[PDB]
Amino acid sequence: HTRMFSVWVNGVDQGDGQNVYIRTPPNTDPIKDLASPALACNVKGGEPVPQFVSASAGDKLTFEWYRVKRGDDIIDPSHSGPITTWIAAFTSPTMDGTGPVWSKIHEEGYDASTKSWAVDKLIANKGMWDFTLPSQLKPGKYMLRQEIVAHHESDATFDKNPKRGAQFYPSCVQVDVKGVGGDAVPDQAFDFNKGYKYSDPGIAFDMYTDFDSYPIPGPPVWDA
Ligand SMILES: [Cu+2]
């Protein structure tokens, strides 16, 4: 259980973004059904919010997460898993993130050398998760998506056992990107409801065995 508080642009806190520039869900509950239209942007994913984070291609963004209060324990430390960041064109304010529209721009999963996950790093960083907006990005409005996946119950799949299954915590942020040039348009066209499957070894994942690696679902990080 976790959700976003705000976005920071090159270290500068843009301030509480909840229902302002983040499409904040009503609570911290996970998405588990891979056929849910909420998988892309969570339950209020289709409801527009009035502001866009102002940023430039190349900027370092920080997405800040919390559990119940800003700057708390962030997420239960049992919720080990990856954290991925994605981008889609802002087609209209009533878009909900469904369809073949996403490109992955950043990911972190399991680090064998420290036996730790993206989630442990998030906790250690007090909920701050950094990534770069690709410098080649064409200016325009975009939806950014960041997702924590918790694998404490991923040793079963939701379709067989709806009490268990991977837990997805997607957050969608509206961003208005100034270019530094660059004309690259995100083109992986990844669809979550089609591309995340119960057969994926990164979703049907048993963390309670002696694994050396974790396969992060979806395509590799977008090129240019
Ligand atoms: Cu939880």
mmCIF file of C-alpha atoms and ligand atoms in Angstrom, residues 1 79 167 169, ligand 1:
data_model
loop_
_atom_site.group_PDB
_atom_site.id
_atom_site.type_symbol
_atom_site.label_atom_id
_atom_site.label_comp_id
_atom_site.label_asym_id
_atom_site.label_seq_id
_atom_site.Cartn_x
_atom_site.Cartn_y
_atom_site.Cartn_z
ATOM 1 C CA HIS A 1 0.000 0.000 0.000
ATOM 2 C CA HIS A 79 6.242 -5.552 -0.525
ATOM 3 C CA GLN A 167 0.044 -6.135 -6.467
ATOM 4 C CA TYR A 169 0.539 0.410 -7.561
HETATM 5 CU CU CU B 1 0.200 -3.112 0.352
#
